[PDB]
Amino acid sequence: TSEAKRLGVKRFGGESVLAGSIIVRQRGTKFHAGANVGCGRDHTLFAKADGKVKFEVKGPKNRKFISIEAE
Amino acid sequence: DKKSARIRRATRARRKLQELGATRLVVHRTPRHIYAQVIAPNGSEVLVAASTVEKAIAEQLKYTGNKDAAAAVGKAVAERALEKGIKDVSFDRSGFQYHGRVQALADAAREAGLQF
Amino acid sequence: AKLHDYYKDEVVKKLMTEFNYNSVMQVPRVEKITLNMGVGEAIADKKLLDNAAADLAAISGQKPLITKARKSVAGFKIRQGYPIGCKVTLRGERMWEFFERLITIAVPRIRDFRGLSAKSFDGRGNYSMGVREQIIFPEIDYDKVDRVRGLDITITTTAKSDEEGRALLAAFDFPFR
RNA sequence: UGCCUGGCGGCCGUAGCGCGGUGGUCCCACCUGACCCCAUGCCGAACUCAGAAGUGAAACGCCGUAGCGCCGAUGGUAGUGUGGGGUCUCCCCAUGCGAGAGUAGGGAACUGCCAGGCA
RNA sequence: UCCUCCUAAAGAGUAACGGAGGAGCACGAAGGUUGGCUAAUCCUGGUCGGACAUCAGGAGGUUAGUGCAAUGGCAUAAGCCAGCUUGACUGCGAGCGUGACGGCGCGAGCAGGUGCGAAAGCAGGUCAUAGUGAUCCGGUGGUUCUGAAUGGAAGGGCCAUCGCUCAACGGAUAAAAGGU
RNA sequence: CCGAUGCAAACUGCGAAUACCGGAGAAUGUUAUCACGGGAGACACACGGCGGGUGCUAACGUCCGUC
């Protein structure tokens, strides 16, 4: 005895995010990609096709999943 | 821990095929009987299922579980798929090894003219 | 195979008569025997460990695998991954033959043969014991002895209590304590 | 159409943890030997070849045990947006939204499709 | 110059030489893919080993680890044995998240050709968050693209690109350094 | 160190109000919304209320987010 990075959710549930849009950019893996959602090298979730976003809880561990469904 | 490990290992392909959302052919192997099922992408319905136990195909088979039975099941699955219009389903090994009866069944199914 | 039939004929029958069981295989069965060396004196020299592994392979029907260290502590002056010893697993005809030959020739001829220590149990049925002077085993000759080394023989036991293990040991009359 | 067994999905502790009983009709389970397809970072450990010759040991389906664990109310409590007041560091007033835990209650799950045995 | 949690009032952002250090490296294997495996921690048995130099029966299931100081998520391990390779290749690339710009990051998908497989499919470096170089200057190879009449040559214009601790790291004119 | 009672900025098996993103909706608001072009103007703000940091949780001291 710097420049802060921009975190948080950019598009929330109900947004008509089109293909290529990134849903959230988090440090680690806060949420896991579900249907029609891809995960990048830097632990970033992005959409693969047009649709409405949704967040769901499933699995023995009760893990949060980000999914996209047809509008 | 054998069945749990088998399920865990099969879960890899089980989830992998989900993203592409294509009909899947799964095989359950047991010395007593062999089962083959065609499952739709939604995963809650089966297009067609065959079992070595059924007499319809066990009449000509000396024993329910063997290479000949696997080949017969493969042929039956292939012809049913051809007459139903599966449109080139994918397949999963269900965590088994593709060297014995699984390979024989796959070859028998492909012999009909499938493109999986 | 060779001894399994006799075991079923005699030991299983005796245990069933003694304990009034129902299932034919209610009596616990031995699955595998693990031969290990607890010498722990091959740190300085690797040729000692190599010769010990060769002796293990010669006595057994299969060669051993070298095992590395698990944790590193400054108290005992040990690093991580340091090869010290090896183990052999026997399950099947080889295991039956090895057990038969042992109980036939090796066990009777032991110096200070005060009997097996039944108290040396894991608390659930598995029995592990070690003895010195591998020269007792006929598979090793006096002309090819480098040093005195101990053994560690552990038998698999599926029982849920020590009474079953004691009965299994008494199956061969358990000469004495 | 009813009982039992195996597989494919949803539900993910109202599905779990501990205890007693039952399951060989069918199904499932222990695999003996492997010089033969397959191989061990040693081991036929797993996988592959022949079933009732040996049985339900362990695993798993079901009933009860509400013992542990979970959810779960109405109500209250702590807090806060808005305007005002006081002894203004903090609190109160009219109004809206409303904690956690626990109590009543529940459950030893349920549900959709396919294969087999007994009816 | 850049990262790591708070103060920072549950989107982002939001202070004072604020509280805190680390990186300016490294792996051309620590990269890709197929099979299987996956604890740590503690009790009990071994010649000593008692837990602590190795082995097997249990308590318990992600408390060990993930190249780094630290950080989040990670048992479908994002680890760890057996095998083969270089997809860390080339032209690219709709769109999205940031910005004042210079620009930065992710990114579905096509084509030319490859590795992992029987296939489904993965491979545009490393689990990630820092780990570097912009303008100008000097050097290499291609282009008749251009060439002050003609045919060349010299010199420029663009393509991959080394040096430039340029480590004053957006880098102020050609102006050498230390002090009472 | 074994179990428990209370506590926390680099503590959450739980979890507000409040803020913010999208969809639908009766009504008001001189389109008050967004796109392009011309013209500018300003680039030491002060104080107060609300919740904090700093300060010796002494200071009509200091800096923040909102009105």
Swiss-Prot record, chain A:
Pfam family, one: Ribosomal_L27
InterPro entries to which the protein is assigned, alphabetical: Ribosomal_bL27 (IPR001684), Ribosomal_bL27_CS (IPR018261)
UniProt keyword annotation of Ribonucleoprotein present: yes
Gene expressing this chain: rpmA
Gene3D superfamilies attached to this UniProt entry: 2.40.50.100
GO MF entry, a single one: ribosome binding
PROSITE patterns assigned to the protein according to its UniProt record, in alphabetical order: RIBOSOMAL_L27
Name under which the protein is recorded: Large ribosomal subunit protein bL27
Disulfide bond annotation, renumbered to this chain: none
Keyword Metal-binding in record: no
Gene Ontology CC, one term: cytoplasm
Gene Ontology BP, a term: assembly of large subunit precursor of preribosome
Keywords: Ribonucleoprotein, Ribosomal protein, RNA-binding, rRNA-binding, tRNA-binding
Similarity comment: Belongs to the bacterial ribosomal protein bL27 family.
Superkingdom, natural source: Bacteria
Assembly with partners or alone: Part of the 50S ribosomal subunit. Cross-links to the 23S rRNA. Cross-links to the A and P site tRNAs.
Curated annotation (Swiss-Prot), chain B:
GO molecular function list: 5S rRNA binding; structural constituent of ribosome
This protein's record includes keyword Ribosomal protein: yes
One CC-aspect GO term: cytosol
Family: Belongs to the universal ribosomal protein uL18 family.
Domain notes: The basic N-terminus is not necessary for binding to 5S rRNA. It is however required for cooperative binding of L5 and L18 to 5S rRNA as well as for binding of the 5S rRNA/L5/L18 complex to the 23S rRNA.
Function: This is one of the proteins that mediates the attachment of the 5S rRNA subcomplex onto the large ribosomal subunit where it forms part of the central protuberance. Binds stably to 5S rRNA; increases binding abilities of L5 in a cooperative fashion; both proteins together confer 23S rRNA binding. The 5S rRNA and some of its associated proteins might help stabilize positioning of ribosome-bound tRNAs.
Full protein name: Large ribosomal subunit protein uL18
Organism: Escherichia coli (strain K12)
Swiss-Prot record, chain C:
Keyword entries, A-Z: Acetylation, Ribonucleoprotein, Ribosomal protein, RNA-binding, rRNA-binding, tRNA-binding
KW Ribosomal protein (keyword) present: yes
Superkingdom, natural source: Bacteria
GO molecular function: 5S rRNA binding; RNA binding; structural constituent of ribosome; tRNA binding
Gene3D superfamilies linked to this entry: 3.30.1440.10
Residue positions where N6-acetyllysine is found in the record: 2
GO biological process terms on file: cytoplasmic translation; ribosomal large subunit assembly; translation
One GO cellular component term: cytosolic large ribosomal subunit
Keyword Transmembrane helix carried by entry: no
Disulfide bonds: none
InterPro entries xref list: Ribosomal_uL5, Ribosomal_uL5_bac-type, Ribosomal_uL5_C, Ribosomal_uL5_CS, Ribosomal_uL5_dom_sf, Ribosomal_uL5_N
Function description: This is one of the proteins that bind and probably mediate the attachment of the 5S RNA into the large ribosomal subunit, where it forms part of the central protuberance. Its 5S rRNA binding is significantly enhanced in the presence of L18.
Family: Belongs to the universal ribosomal protein uL5 family.
Assembly behavior: Part of the 50S ribosomal subunit; part of the 5S rRNA/L5/L18/L25 subcomplex. Contacts the 5S rRNA; cross-links to the P site tRNA. Forms a bridge to the 30S subunit in the 70S ribosome, contacting protein S13 and S19.
NCBIfam families in the cross-refs: PRK00010.1 (NF000585)
Note: Identified as a multicopy suppressor of the slow growth phenotype of an rsgA (yjeQ) deletion mutant.
Entry protein name: Large ribosomal subunit protein uL5
Species per Swiss-Prot/TrEMBL record: Escherichia coli (strain K12)
Source lineage: Bacteria, Pseudomonadati, Pseudomonadota, Gammaproteobacteria, Enterobacterales
